[PDB]
Design an enzyme around this catalytic site. Structure first.
Site, PDB file in Angstrom:
ATOM      1  N   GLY A   1    -102.211   2.704  30.419  1.00  0.00           N
ATOM      2  CA  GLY A   1    -102.686   4.031  29.488  1.00  0.00           C
ATOM      3  C   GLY A   1    -101.960   4.132  28.309  1.00  0.00           C
TER       4      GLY A   1
ATOM      5  N   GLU B   1     -89.196  -6.409  23.341  1.00  0.00           N
ATOM      6  CA  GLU B   1     -90.193  -6.000  24.234  1.00  0.00           C
ATOM      7  C   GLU B   1     -90.110  -6.786  25.753  1.00  0.00           C
ATOM      8  OE1 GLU B   1     -92.688  -3.424  23.592  1.00  0.00           O
ATOM      9  OE2 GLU B   1     -92.443  -2.887  21.838  1.00  0.00           O
ATOM     10  N   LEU B   2     -89.702  -6.063  26.600  1.00  0.00           N
ATOM     11  CA  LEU B   2     -89.260  -6.957  27.563  1.00  0.00           C
ATOM     12  C   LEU B   2     -89.951  -6.444  28.940  1.00  0.00           C
ATOM     13  CD1 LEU B   2     -85.308  -7.741  26.977  1.00  0.00           C
ATOM     14  CD2 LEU B   2     -87.343  -8.729  25.834  1.00  0.00           C
TER      15      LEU B   2
ATOM     16  N   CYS C   1     -97.426  -6.706  31.308  1.00  0.00           N
ATOM     17  CA  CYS C   1     -96.350  -5.986  31.216  1.00  0.00           C
ATOM     18  C   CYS C   1     -96.189  -4.385  31.843  1.00  0.00           C
ATOM     19  CB  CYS C   1     -95.471  -5.929  29.829  1.00  0.00           C
ATOM     20  SG  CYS C   1     -96.631  -5.193  28.359  1.00  0.00           S
ATOM     21  N   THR C   2     -97.259  -3.712  31.554  1.00  0.00           N
ATOM     22  CA  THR C   2     -97.531  -2.326  32.248  1.00  0.00           C
ATOM     23  C   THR C   2     -98.180  -2.301  33.630  1.00  0.00           C
ATOM     24  OG1 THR C   2     -99.617  -2.094  31.166  1.00  0.00           O
ATOM     25  CG2 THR C   2     -97.731  -1.333  29.827  1.00  0.00           C
TER      26      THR C   2
ATOM     27  N   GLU D   1     -88.687  -7.551  38.883  1.00  0.00           N
ATOM     28  CA  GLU D   1     -90.286  -7.568  38.128  1.00  0.00           C
ATOM     29  C   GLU D   1     -90.631  -9.028  38.748  1.00  0.00           C
ATOM     30  OE1 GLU D   1     -90.946  -8.935  34.340  1.00  0.00           O
ATOM     31  OE2 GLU D   1     -92.146  -7.355  33.877  1.00  0.00           O
TER      32      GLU D   1
END
Lengths: 509, 509, 509, 509
Positions: free
Chosen positions: D459, D266-267, D300-301, D397
């Protein structure tokens, strides 16, 4: 003289049909009941005869079908799928002549007769894959040293009663799925499409016999209410799939319920199209026209109610009228023909009865409403405006090409009018509004088994379960997990441990 | 004097019970129907009174429930799951007193009274997870630019009629599942467990009220056949889940079918245990004992027929005899008691009638067969040998602890014997033989809804679907995809393209 | 001289093979790389030549495939299924000659050659049904006014690298599933089965081109380590399905992980059969023989380790020896032949090396261990006793018919010995004990991807996912939801409401 | 002086936290590695200390965890769910104080710290239901007398490495799922959220101990890269779930691939919001603001790229500027605060490097871009316009609140621009267009694991699987069938028949 004896119709012989055909197959062919003559609705000419099933014929066929089930249930499902694959292939080889018979004996246009056989072909190929998939989950038991599995097994004999208007596909959907599920089948088609039933049975029977399987796996007993009623009362018919009118289907459901049988009911429709103000009218008009007049309005999913937002109501009605006048009428096997006759003379009488009733209830015929002065059972596709959405004739399924058109203003009321009828088969909205679409799909939307957006009321494919709610009967056919209706579920707990239950103070040995 | 007015039973008040209780709840408590007094079957002493629903109460409650459904279906399913979680926790807080009431009013022993509530707690917690999972697949459409989705939506109002013998859990299974599925519930419990229904409803009513939700989501109308029949005839009851006798259930199924409603039928059982020659006798004897006499033989899944291979028949009977003698009888709430009274005196009359009938049909009472000389509805747990497997009394469900023992030789005939009755709920074989085990689970095996191996006929957990076949009704509860009975499926085709239908030669604009 | 030029083998021309064949297909046929001549292992004679892919060939092919994917991804999944159905039929028409080529170029016996092609036919027919089924659930969102759906979409270009020993089936499984899932494929087969790869691609190429589809949907670049490595490093290869040695597979897996690609790894096996004291020896002995010597021991699922309970060890070995002596050796295309040659001369030497190594580690050759004095790469199927279960050669995969036999006493230790190796492909116990069977299937049981009971290590069908654990790579092919590796999941939240998010004290407009 | 030693922070003791806390739990508490002090990022004050794991601490803990797995794997999955239910309850009791610890030590606002714990509570309740559902299908074997079952078993030890920004929820998702699936867990949290990790471990450890279960089922070894690297290289860690940067995650994936372990990655994300001209701008602007500046841009989102149609670009940028001006800055434990500090001073330094780089690459800072001159790690939330969509800094990022804004005109190019980066986590479009929405969800739409419509990039709910594609690593957490990554599938063929394989001409005994 019979059409089958005329050289123009010599192609019927490619289906193994003759002047007088046996209407019972259970591994052997017979028929000791009344001889029925079926007629071409395009010219009222007799085609050929079918010897229907007597009681003794039915009794022997049920016994033979249950015997064959002992063999067929032991064949691994993937191997049953292979048979169904071969059934699909045998249908492909005959698709043209078979579709021509559907056009000839039932009266729908040639592309739809051929299309009906394609549906049988397609469901077979779908069912081949399903035959390696059917089953239930292995679940985690709360009990140590125990397994919990959900098993699915055939119910046994599936009786399949079908209607005149889809004389191949409906049986096809039930047959391909019931067969991979390990069941034997007993078919009683509509008397007026007996040749279609016989022709299909011959194609299937050849595959079974080439595979050295007992022909009774796909038994046929042609007959009318007599045979249909026996099946509904017969404890040996483990599942009775009935496709037909709501009136008859209700009594079949009660007879099956009385004996704690299984029924799968595919009953009547009263399907609405709703066009909202934002709808693409270039999509609405053709979609409505083809959904209303296709198959001369004799589909279970035919659009019989058209709700148009008041802002666009008059334009849609006018554009629909200009389009209806361009419908090309002719023999359903002749090319470019879009519109054939009603299936029977009786339907013509029911058509005329409905038109007068709509007039008395305040409706105005803005197009059609009359019989066509030509041979066969041809009536004009008809548009009726001005009726109240609650008019009794509007709430009735008249299996004829009559489209009742209504005005509406708001979304909440017109969803309610869609749902207010007792039928619950198909429904469609035409709109671009994202919130409205999901409201339509949601718990306050359409109450039907088929709920469409920007495609009319006949939009349905093999992938999904097909069927309706309320008086449409509740059964499902073809796709999704509809196969579960053709099988019995068992929840199985297996103790493989050495553990003994608690003695609870009792001294055991 | 009423038990509730004695200081010894003041714990009843912790459940909100009083001398005279309201048996109608729809957000308000009331009841204009007949006042019923329920009795403790352990001593035939009156406990308390409940005012049942009149017709006016039922009409008012159904209207309020259907209004509340508009609110409840708008609540996202996971949030309905949160409500069910809170119901589960509320039951946890009352588990001891509620189990005692089940023991007091119904008559099963306390550990099973508590266990019945725990099942409701457990099925609630399960439904919390399920509330984030219910739905259907997105299917790949054959039409370019179309989506094909299977939607599930609540059916609306789920009527739930339950039997006396599981007066908490059965309602619980239907409530937790129907609620997360977006339905409102209307409960009509067995008249002789009216206090249990009120107590459970009070626990749920507080949770709903604390969440500012209309209480009629879990409505209660206490009554007998009169209210039960109205639910079966009421078009407003979209699904009627009925748990009870086959005799009554058949009439409910016909009434629901007559109006094209949905029914979920959980009817009678006649459940067999088969002990093969290789069975572990140290597992067979206690398993059969506890399954045969548990709940005084008043579980739908009670072992009522025991088939033993000839080689071990006499030894198993002798060991069952030695064990039956140690069954500890007493008040069902008294510590260490294993066996309480039958629910009613009428049940005792059926017991004695069955015993006398079996003796007349040639059976021998090798244990029990008599009333116990004590207060309450106590009969001796009974073992009957020597009857032929086809004896009429062996084929009838007598809801009492009578275990009919039969000899057999072969696997096929004893599988036939399991299947020869009209009931189809539960079944067990005890054996070590791998091939036999899978034949039992297969198409030539048990025809029942629960198919067990080395665990008796009451082996079932919430993870799987629970229900029977044939005269047991075909309904399923709790696990697997049983939730689908509480919803309506729609197959939805969405055209999101700009593509127009083929013109087919018609000139549109 | 080439076998293809001798009249004895003119049937090769029925597959479109010639003396020098193009080994690149991307819609066009070409090949500017090295020309490889492949040989028949049964007589060490050259068959025909293949022009392999140059780098430029590979670059051009990948580009053409990704352009073709834009068209192919737009084709509805069911219609992609129709293409796959036709590939199945084209393979049927060539099944005899294609299997004969597999026997000729790879060296397995004919029935296994035709069986391998039947496997491709079967998975195609499966993939047709799956093409109407692939997708995800619609989930109940916790947010009012929102839909929550799980979507599945193709990954794009699926590279498929395959091994010599299943030169048709492995590719077939990947191709059928990847194609209905909307992917284009790039195949790099084993160089020593290049004619088979060319022959299969020609059959596929005709179906695609007959359907007016770009041929690059099923692209072919024949080559060795060069082309495979480029595929493993090529970011344009969205999924690389690799079947081959653990040694190469480990490097392939690391390269793909380096670029955050997807890999599906089907690597080496070291498959054990365990025979317990209660096993049916009349089932055990042939099961072991056929699983150990089938395909001259060159299946990934070949039985290479045989654990026998000490009580029956000497008897099972003696019975195996008596059966091994009757194994019939010959040309793999001859109908009486059960045992063909090893694939290469190197494989023969490796056989001898392993045998010598087994003797050096203390093993006794009790049957076989030598090359056969005949033309071709024929070795005697070999049984070795006395090695420790932890012997270095026993923990190695030697791709040859060498069976290492071990004694065991207890169930737990022999499960431990099944699991102690690095490979985790297939496993079998033979036993009647119910508890032992479920323990074997359970968490303290076998650690393999295929866990069989009373059927050997090659027991597998397309219905299930096929693959192993540990150094077997973890990938899965064919059945169940193996299709998900060929697609990318998206979890999709759609706000269709009019609702605006909370202002959190900020003044918006 | 430590915050924990001040009376203002006496609430930390409600979590069992003290001056120096043991950072190793395996049933016993320990920690012989370096003592780390964690600081409040709002004011750089030291909070309390944690004794981290030495190598020996790690070695002992893994062994203790694997020993505990033997006990835990034998516990029925539903009963493991009951444990997780109790974990859900223990978290419920501490949600406020634990959420305060999250705000204090990690630095997000109080509602989000508390929300993070609620997420763990929610996934527990979900996993309780899932623990009665996990498993595979029973498939219909093509072989007579054979059963085909897909079994799932725990992988064993699940290593869990988590990131600073969700120091509770991420672990919770893995733990709830891993535990019901029968795995033990070894947690290594981010060093700078060590107190949070210990506080959580204390809560779980109490539940395990109250249930007389070995604490190593949920082991904790606090540490940095060294312990993290050891877990990735350790053959005893069967699955390593890693949440963190792509840079670190890539090396973790390679190390796990090297030893043929399993990884769940999960990067990083580089998530785009796309606003089309038809968008509800009153929905877009707040959606964009909260998704860009939420958690100080350290989700992360987090929305890091904003694509706006040129017709509305300036208005959305202006309205976003006016909304940014009202973001309330302060201590994250103040209830009126919306915006707290970045987690570390290094993060501030990376923020500054990004802003400078954006200027150097041609972007204009239209809001923010500076450090705030105040205690703690506060930076201004930042909007950058004028960069080309392919500017290198926009493709990077930077875990900071920097929003890069771009113009676009047509739908095809902006979907390409969403997809052009290496990250593949979340994506959002704002539009009302039905066809555009489904194109976005289709094969030519977003390539991310989260694909949203009219809801921003953050979301997601537990009901769905959470994770991304491409450089985000491919792993999935929480919902759908994410549980399968925590188990191993076995395809199991069971021959229960007496049938023997064909002798193929061999005479067996």
């Amino acid at each position: 003289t019979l059409l089958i004896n005329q050289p123009q119709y010599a192609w019927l012989k490619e289906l193994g049909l003759r002047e007088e055909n046996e209407g019972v197959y259970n591994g052997s062919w017979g028929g000791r009941g009344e001889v029925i003559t079926t007629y071409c609705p395009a010219n009222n000419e007799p085609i050929a005869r079918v010897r229907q099933a007597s009681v003794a014929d039915y009794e022997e066929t049920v016994k033979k079908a249950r015997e064959a089930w002992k063999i067929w249930a032991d064949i691994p499902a993937p191997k049953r799928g292979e048979i169904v694959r071969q059934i699909g292939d045998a249908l492909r080889e005959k698709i043209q002549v078979l579709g021509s018979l559907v056009s000839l004996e039932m009266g729908k246009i040639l592309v739809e007769g051929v299309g009906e056989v394609q549906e049988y072909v397609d469901i077979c190929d779908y069912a081949v894959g399903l035959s390696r998939m059917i089953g239930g989950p292995i679940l985690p038991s709360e009990r140590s040293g125990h397994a919990l599995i959900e098993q699915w097994n055939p119910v046994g004999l599936v009786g399949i009663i079908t209607a005149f208007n889809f004389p191949v596909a409906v049986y096809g959907w039930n047959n391909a799925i019931a067969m991979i599920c390990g069941n034997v089948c007993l078919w009683k088609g509509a008397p007026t499409t007996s040749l279609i039933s016989v022709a299909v049975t011959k194609i299937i029977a050849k595959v079974l016999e080439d595979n050295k399987l007992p022909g009774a796996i796909c038994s046929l007993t042609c007959g009318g209410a007599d045979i249909g009623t026996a099946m509904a009362k017969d404890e040996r018919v483990n599942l009775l799939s009935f496709t037909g009118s709501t009136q008859v289907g209700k009594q079949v459901g009660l007879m099956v319920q009385e004996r704690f049988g299984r029924s799968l009911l595919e009953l009547g429709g009263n399907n609405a199209i709703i066009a909202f103000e934002d709808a693409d009218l270039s999509l609405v008009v053709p979609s409505a026209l083809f959904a209303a007049v296709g198959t001369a309005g004799q589909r279970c999913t035919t659009a019989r109610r058209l709700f148009i937002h008041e802002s666009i109501h008059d334009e849609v009605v006018n554009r629909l009228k200009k389009a209806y006048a361009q419908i090309r009428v002719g023999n359903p096997w002749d090319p470019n023909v879009l519109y054939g006759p009603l299936h029977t003379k009786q339907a013509v009488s029911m058509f005329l009865g409905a038109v007068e009733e709509a007039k008395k209830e305040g409706g105005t015929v803005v197009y059609g409403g009359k019989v066509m002065d030509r041979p066969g059972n041809y009536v004009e596709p008809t548009i009726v405006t001005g009726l109240g959405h609650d008019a009794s004739i509007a709430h009735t399924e008249t299996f004829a090409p009559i489209l009742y058109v209504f005005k509406f203003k708001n979304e909440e009321e017109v969803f309610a009018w869609n749902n207010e009828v007792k039928q619950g088969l198909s429904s469609s909205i035409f709109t671009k509004d994202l919130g409205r679409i999901f409201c339509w799909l949601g718990p306050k939307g359409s109450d039907c088994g088929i709920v469409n957006v920007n495609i009319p009321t006949s939009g349905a494919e093999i992938g999904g379960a097909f069927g309706g709610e309320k008086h449409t009967g509740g059964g499902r056919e073809s796709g999704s997990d509809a196969w579960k209706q053709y099988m019995r579920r068992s929840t199985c707990t297996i103790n493989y441990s050495k553990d003994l239950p608690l003695a609870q103070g009792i001294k055991f040995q």
